[PDB]
DNA sequence: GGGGGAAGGATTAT
DNA sequence: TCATGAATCCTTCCCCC
């Protein structure tokens with residue numbers, strides 16, 4: 001299997017630069033403003049001019065403005081980015097029908113039937129890079145390797161505006177030298193738990209016994225790291241289907257008074273049904289973000305599709321179950337739909 | 342025992 | 356005084372043959 005992974009560089013920030021080229025060279029910070037208070041929310045992404053100074057995805061906008069008060073802070077325009085993304089994804093389908101769109105700015109292409117060796121692949125990668133740049137003015141990073149994971153790692157090493165191949169030999173070196181924390185799917189919590197087990201590189205997962213790994217990081221993650229260490233990972237590039245869709249809204253003030261919360265929830269449902277866009281869910285979950293920012297949720301699965309009306313009444317019952325089983329105040333209240341017909 | 346699948350907290354990446 | 360203008364992951368837990 002020969003895999004070509006495309007990762008659009010600082011995508012939201014880049015798209016804003018394309019739509020307003022005068023931003024190029026300036027620190028650009030794309031944020032999600034929550035509404036709770038002045039500059040409350042989080043940074044969705046920052047271009048490298050802003051990243052240099054520590055402004056990166058996930059940090060509070062207030063924290064970012066204390067570092068770069070003069071940087072350009074733009075509200076996230078998801079719809080715009082999604083459309084530019086769709087167009088780029090379409091360009092990618094012209095190089096391979098076997099495409100897995102992992103997210104709005106990442107895609108895996110199984111180009112096995114299209115290229116013979118890694119030299120080909122690389123040339124295709126440069127062709128893909130140039131095409132996107134020409135058609136959309138977006139620079140991407142291409143990662144090429146034997147499976148989806150190393151192609152992603154390849155891209156992680158080559159970004160931004162890069163292209164890296166990791167041949168069957170460098171894979172073996174990485175299985176020994178790469179910080180296991182740099183492996184896709186292993187976030188801060190699993191990394192730290194692996195550290196306490198004594199595992200720091202992929203090869204180490206082989207020295208530990210399975211039941212110990214399984215107990216610490218979980219069966220799924222355990223088999224995954226082991227398969228990677230054994231150089232046996234070969235998951236197929238497949239079409240990804242969004243499994244759940246939701247809407248979470250911030251309330252004007254923290255509450256646990258059902259009638260104060262209701263409007264927000266109902267609006268969340270009303271807007272969720274629009275994003276469902278034809279999809280009919282058989283499951284619904286009411287999500288409550290408490291005052292200490294913890295998450296509590298309650299859901300129910302139906303033997304049939306859920307109508308907006310059924311959603312309205314069931315959500316209230318579910319929200320009551322939250323307020324009943326959890327005593328904290330609700331900051332944000334949302335709904336989530338899944339198990340589509 | 343384990344297929345199946347529901348529930349919901351845990352985790353990842355932005 | 357945090358959001359993904361969340362979504363998925365994935366571990367229980369339970370029914371039931």
Ligand SMILES: *[C@H]1c2c(cc3ccc4cccc5ccc2c3c45)[C@@H](O)[C@H](O)[C@@H]1O
Nearest residue numbers: 078079082270271272273274275276360
């Ligand atoms: C934000 C997002 C998306 C889809 C929709 C669809 C319909 C909406 C109606 C009203 C409000 C609203 C807010 C955010 C939305 C909406 C709506 C997604 O396509 C996007 O990825 C974000 O989740």
Ligand SMILES: [Ca+2]
Nearest residue numbers: 007008009105
């Ligand atoms: Ca990216």
Ligand SMILES: [Ca+2]
Nearest residue numbers: 007103105106
């Ligand atoms: Ca990404």
